[PDB]
Structure formats: C-alpha cells, structure tokens
Amino acid sequence: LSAEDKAAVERSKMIDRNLREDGEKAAREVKLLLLGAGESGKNTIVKQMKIGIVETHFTFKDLHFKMFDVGAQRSERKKWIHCFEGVTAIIFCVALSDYDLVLAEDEEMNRMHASMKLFDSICNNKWFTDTSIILFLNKKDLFEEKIKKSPLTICYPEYAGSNTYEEAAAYIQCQFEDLNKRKDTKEIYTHFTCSTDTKNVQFVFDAVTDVIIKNNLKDCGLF
Amino acid sequence: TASIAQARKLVEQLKMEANIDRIKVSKAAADLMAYCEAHAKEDPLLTPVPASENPF
Amino acid sequence: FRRVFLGLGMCFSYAALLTKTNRIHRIFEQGKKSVTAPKFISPASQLVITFSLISVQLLGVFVWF
Amino acid sequence: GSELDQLRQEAEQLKNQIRDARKACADATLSQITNNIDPVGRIQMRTRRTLRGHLAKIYAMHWGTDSRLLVSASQDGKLIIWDSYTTNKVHAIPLRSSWVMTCAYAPSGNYVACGGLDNICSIYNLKTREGNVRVSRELAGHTGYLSCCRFLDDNQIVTSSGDTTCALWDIETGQQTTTFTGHTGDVMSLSLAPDTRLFVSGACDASAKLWDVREGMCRQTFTGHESDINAICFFPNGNAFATGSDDATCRLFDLRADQELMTYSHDNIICGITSVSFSKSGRLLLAGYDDFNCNVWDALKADRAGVLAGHDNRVSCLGVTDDGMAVATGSWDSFLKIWN
C-alpha cells in the first residue's frame, strides 16, 4: 500500500469518527410531527412551545425537541408520509369552535367532520400503528361562549344531552377517541388548550416521557 | 374564463400530438432487437468477465 | 457438596433481584432525559451479569478448595 | 356552456384519431418478432462491496462519469462521496434540510446537487482552493417537493417537482429559463436523453410525457398504467424508455411508434416498483421492488432473468455505471451494495 493510500485511509477514518459522533448526537432528540387544520390554532401552539417544511428546535428540562411542521405542503400525502415513520409522537389540533361552520367552499360540509375524517385517516395509517397521538382540543373559550346560543345538534344529530360545557366537550372528545381501531398498540392523550394556557409544554413533556418509557419497557420484553 | 382557456389549450395540444409521422411497430421492434446484437459483447452483466480486469 | 452448595441459592436469588431492580431503575431514570434506550437491558445481558456475580462466589470457593 | 361541450367533443374526436392511428401501426407484437431468440441464461450475481456508515434511510444515489466515484443521500442529513474501488470516503457534506429525496453528480465532477421537501435544489462545489465543500447556489422557485434532478452541464440543470411542473435552470444567474407544464398529477422522476436534447417524465396521473429541452413543448404523451409511475429511464439507443408503477408492473415505450411495446409482470409479486435502470447492451432491465428484492428482466423476452436478495428493507435506488461493470443498490436498511 502506497503512502497516498495510507493518507486516504486516514482521512476515511476521520470521516467515520465524525459521522458516528453526529449520529449519536442525533439519536437523543425527540422528533414530533405537527398535523392539523390550517385555522386549527397551530400557530399559537407553535408560539407557546418555543419560548416547505418549517422546523422549530426547543428544549425543556434538559431534553430536546425538533417539532417538524408540514402545513404548507399542497400535494399527495401518500408520497411523502412514509418519511415520518420513525417519529416519537404526532400532535393533532382540532379547534372545537368549528362545529357550526363550513369549509373548502363546499357549503355542505361541517369543519369538524373534515377534522374527524383527517384524524381517522392519520390514526389508522399503515405507517402509524404504534405511534401515540397528542390531541389538542383548543379554542375552548369560543366554544364556551358559543354553546349557549347554538346547540350541538347542528354537528351531531344524536346528542341526548344537555347544553353545557361539561357534557358537550366530553361528547366531542369521546367521538375522536372512538375512531381509534388500534386500542391495544397505541393511545391518545387529550388536552384542552386555550389562549394564555402556558401549560402545554409540560403536558407534551409528560406524554412523550411516558411514550419513551413504554417503548423501552416493550423492547426489554418487560411490559 | 379559465375553463374555456384550458379547453382551448388541450385542443391545441391534442392537434399538435396527432400529427406525428408514426412508423409501424415491426420496424421499431427490429430496430431495438438489433441494438443488443451489435453491443452484446461489450456488456459484462450478462456475459461474465474474467477475474483479470474485475475492478471489484 | 456442603462446602459448595451452602451459599449458592442465596447468591442466585439476590443477584437476580439486584439485576432486575437495577434494570427498572435505569429505564425509568433515563426515560426522562434521552430517547435512546439504556444499554444492556435484555434477557441475554441480564443473565450475563447475574452469572458473572455468581462466578465471583464460585471462584472464591475454588480458592478455598 | 354550449361551446364548453363543443370543446369537449373536439377533445374526444382528437383522442379517437390518436387511438385509431395507433391501432393502424401495430403490425405485430414484440413477442412475435422475438419469438425465436437465444434465451438469456440465469444471472447469478453476488455482492462484492458493502458500503456502511449511513445511519438512516437512503433515498438516492448517482454514479460518476469515471465509474469510480459515487454519491449517496440519506435522511440522516448527510451526502457522502465514496471511492468504490477502495470503499474509502472522499467527502462528507452536511445538509441543511435532512429531508432529501434526490441527489445528482455532475458530468464534469466538480458539482453535486441535492433536494427534497424544501422546494430548493442545492448545488455544492467539490474543487475549491480552501479544501472544503461549499454551497455554490440555492435554486428556488418550485412550490412543491423536489422528486428528481439531473445535470446537463456545469451551467444547466433540470428539476422535477410535486407541483406538477418541470424546470430548466441556468446556475450563473439562478433563474428558471424554461418551465414545462402539463401532468395534472405529481411528477416523480425524469430521465435525460444520451444526446441531451430531450427528456421524459413520469407522474401520478399514470402517464408519461416527452419534452424538448429547447422550445419548452411537449411532443408525445404515453398512457397504459393503472396507478402512479415512480421511476423512468432511457434505453441506451435513446429511442425508447421504461416505466415502473404501483400496479406491480413495468412497461416499455418506443417513440417513433408512440405506443407501449412490452409489459413485465407476474402473479407472485403484488408490490410496486421504486427504481428502474438499464444495462449497457439494453438486453437487461433492472428493477427494485417493495418486497426487499431486485429483479432482473430480459427486455426482448420479458422473463425473469434474476433475483438479488441481500437486503433487509425496501430497495430504493439503483445505478448501473457508464462502462457496464457494476450495479449499485441503495435501500432503506442503511446500506449500499455493489453487485457484479
């Protein structure tokens, strides 16, 4: 082996060392996929987490998150959805103050029905069979102020319940957690977000920590 | 307005497509069935190469 | 047989207990700090650790003999 | 209203003229002419090199002109240049996006391009006086994810996007000289002609199109599939190309008789095709599938000629090299394998 070849092997070993260090660094970060409707309050939640694709790094209690967002990607989701098979969790927003509205100029489509359809598609996808979901049900104050004048019968014909923030919110929540047909592999963490909530980072921290511990226990065959 | 413009654009595109000089399929098949015979001996994926050259 | 087997059962039981409790502690402690699973949490590695701790007593008994 | 119907009716009339003119050209089938041809023997290739170092899914690769140097793009945020002869690593380039889908190696060898899920095609300079690989230009203008890019020269590039359009760029000024429109569905791949005069593209509308590099016009459109087209490549002559789809089939199209010639299919495969490349003679057609395998077909007879099985996940990219020696596969299992 010539001296030049020895120099080449030296350089290759340096490159391998650098790549190993970078991979070990990248393996310890939480990767989140932020999904939701355009007007579902994604921007406010993004703002209160951090104190084509848009990336937002943020740290909480000595742990790191990257939090990818794909809202501005108007194309077929089946083509690029498999790029997110190995993410830690999926965050999904609903915007409860949408049960008496219409979208996409269809003029016969409840916004919340479209949200349920999207949730059903994402939850029962082939690439996401063991990925937990954090469901934020936000704009609850508008729901509280609105529920008096308009009942839930516009969005749900069968309600058999009272018009109060105590029972309608729970009714909407039990609708979304009943579309999950994989109850023995994943779970849904539901939280009610609002303006100046300031307590959503900790909820995400708790959910992701539980997810990590459960994954590690399942790998050991200990769960 | 946009729909009629799209329709006219498709009409022009189809009329440009439908005026090609198309040869019959036997000629194309013979033309491509003869390329391999001309370049068979220089392709080592189907004919193995002796271990002398074999960069790998 | 008396010399070898007198303290072997207690060693077995308590080495196994120590290894399993350590596994649970490490999992639930590093679960709050990194995504990556802690190293050596698997039946093979745990058995290796347990039988190394037993091998200590076995070698001591050998020196005694 | 009425003239909308008139335009539609003219459209079906033009389609009918196209189809019966096509049927007036089919003397026989490729199987009829190639009925009596010396069968290709069984190909038994074995892996010779194994390139390790990537830590995530690999999404694209491209061979160099010299047939030694290689480029690989992974979702780990890395673009790696390999010396295949010695397995050595020549350059490691960090990526700003890490959501790459495509990469390319320039004919001159001084430039490398990459792109994906950022609507930007990035160009890197390999030969610099400072001794490091730097960004030369960031091409922007697409409104959808990049799917494939190819170099024409040092100063000309072509890109395809998920916004259903293609583009030609001059790199000194970084502007779109020509835009190619059509393809009502998402574009997935493109292939350049050997004379760099035309190029073909495949889309999610289950159709392919042939474009002229100058004049920005579409000349021929080809149909025949039941689902999305994922890969495309030219036959070495330059008078035909091949496409692979999600309907678990491959097909071959000629240009002078603008219709389908042959379809490669079986009953044991139900998964789609991710990549397609030709050999130097054109007698062999290589295709990577979703069942972790690579299948080698005989183009003139359409029979299974070989299977390559050494991968633990989906095979995503192929390359055949300019002098015909080695084939390279890149897969989701983070490894590149070279076969001969």
Swiss-Prot record, chain A:
Organism, as annotated: Homo sapiens (Human)
Record InterPro entries: Gprotein_alpha_I, Gprotein_alpha_su, GproteinA_insert, P-loop_NTPase
PTM characteristics: (Microbial infection) Deamidated at Gln-73 by Photorhabdus asymbiotica toxin PAU_02230, blocking GTP hydrolysis of heterotrimeric GNAQ or GNA11 and G-alphai (GNAI1, GNAI2 or GNAI3) proteins, thereby activating RhoA.
Region (G3 motif), start-end ranges: 65-74
Region (G1 motif): 31-44
Similarity comment: Belongs to the G-alpha family. G(i/o/t/z) subfamily.
Protein location: Nucleus; Cytoplasm; Cell membrane; Cytoplasm, Cytoskeleton, Microtubule organizing center, Centrosome
Keyword hit for Cell division: yes
Cleavable signal peptide: none
Protein name: Guanine nucleotide-binding protein G(i) subunit alpha-1
GO biological process terms, semicolon-separated: adenylate cyclase-inhibiting G protein-coupled receptor signaling pathway; adenylate cyclase-inhibiting serotonin receptor signaling pathway; adenylate cyclase-modulating G protein-coupled receptor signaling pathway; cell division; cellular response to forskolin; G protein-coupled receptor signaling pathway; negative regulation of insulin secretion; positive regulation of cholesterol biosynthetic process
Region of interest (G4 motif), ranges: 134-141
Family matches, as Gene3D superfamilies: GI Alpha 1, domain 2-like (1.10.400.10), P-loop containing nucleotide triphosphate hydrolases (3.40.50.300)
SMART domains recorded: G_alpha
Modified residues annotated as ADP-ribosylcysteine in this record: 220
Enzyme class: hydrolase
Curated annotation (Swiss-Prot), chain B:
Subunit architecture: G proteins are composed of 3 units, alpha, beta and gamma. In this context, interacts with GNB2. The heterodimer formed by GNB1 and GNG2 interacts with ARHGEF5. The heterodimer formed by GNB1 and GNG2 interacts with GRK2. Forms complexes with TAS2R14 and G-proteins; these complexes play a role in the perception of bitterness. Component of the TAS2R14-GNAI1 complex, consisting of TAS2R14, GNAI1, GNB1 and GNG2. Component of the TAS2R14-GNAT3 complex, consisting of TAS2R14, GNAT3, GNB1 and GNG2. Component of the TAS2R14-GNAS2 complex, consisting of TAS2R14, GNAS2, GNB1 and GNG2.
Protein name: Guanine nucleotide-binding protein G(I)/G(S)/G(O) subunit gamma-2
Example GO molecular function: G-protein beta-subunit binding
Taxonomic lineage of the native organism: Eukaryota, Metazoa, Chordata, Craniata, Vertebrata
Domain of life: Eukaryota
BP-aspect Gene Ontology terms: adenylate cyclase-activating dopamine receptor signaling pathway; cellular response to catecholamine stimulus; cellular response to prostaglandin E stimulus; fibroblast proliferation; G protein-coupled receptor signaling pathway
One Gene Ontology CC term in the entry: synapse
Localization of this protein: Cell membrane
UniProtKB/Swiss-Prot annotation, chain C:
Protein task: G-protein coupled receptor for glutamate. Ligand binding causes a conformation change that triggers signaling via guanine nucleotide-binding proteins (G proteins) and modulates the activity of down-stream effectors, such as adenylate cyclase. Signaling inhibits adenylate cyclase activity.
Full-protein residues shown: 650 to 714 of 908
Cellular compartments annotated: Cell membrane
Family: Belongs to the G-protein coupled receptor 3 family.
Subunit structure: Interacts with PICK1.
Transmembrane intervals: 1-19, 47-65
Residues on Cytoplasmic side: 20-46
Highest taxon in the source lineage: Eukaryota
Protein name: Metabotropic glutamate receptor 8
Curated annotation (Swiss-Prot), chain D:
Function comment: Guanine nucleotide-binding proteins (G proteins) are involved as a modulator or transducer in various transmembrane signaling systems. The beta and gamma chains are required for the GTPase activity, for replacement of GDP by GTP, and for G protein-effector interaction.
Record-given protein name: Guanine nucleotide-binding protein G(I)/G(S)/G(T) subunit beta-1
Mutagenesis or variant effect for residue 52 to G: In MRD42; decreases receptor-driven G protein activation; no effect on protein abundance; no effect on complex formation with gamma subunit; decreases trimer formation with alpha and gamma subunit
Result when mutating residue 64 to V: In MRD42; decreases receptor-driven G protein activation; decreases protein abundance; decreases complex formation with gamma subunit; decreases trimer formation with alpha and gamma subunit
Positions bearing Phosphohistidine: 266
Annotated effect of mutating residue 118 to G: In MRD42; decreases receptor-driven G protein activation; no effect on protein abundance; no effect on complex formation with gamma subunit; no effect on trimer formation with alpha and gamma subunits
Entry GO terms, CC: cytoplasm; cytosol; extracellular exosome; extracellular vesicle; heterotrimeric G-protein complex; lysosomal membrane; membrane; photoreceptor disc membrane
SUPFAM superfamilies reported in the protein's UniProt record: WD40 repeat-like
Record's keyword terms, sorted: Acetylation, Disease variant, Host-virus interaction, Intellectual disability, Phosphoprotein, Repeat, Transducer, WD repeat
GN (gene name): GNB1
Species of origin: Homo sapiens (Human)
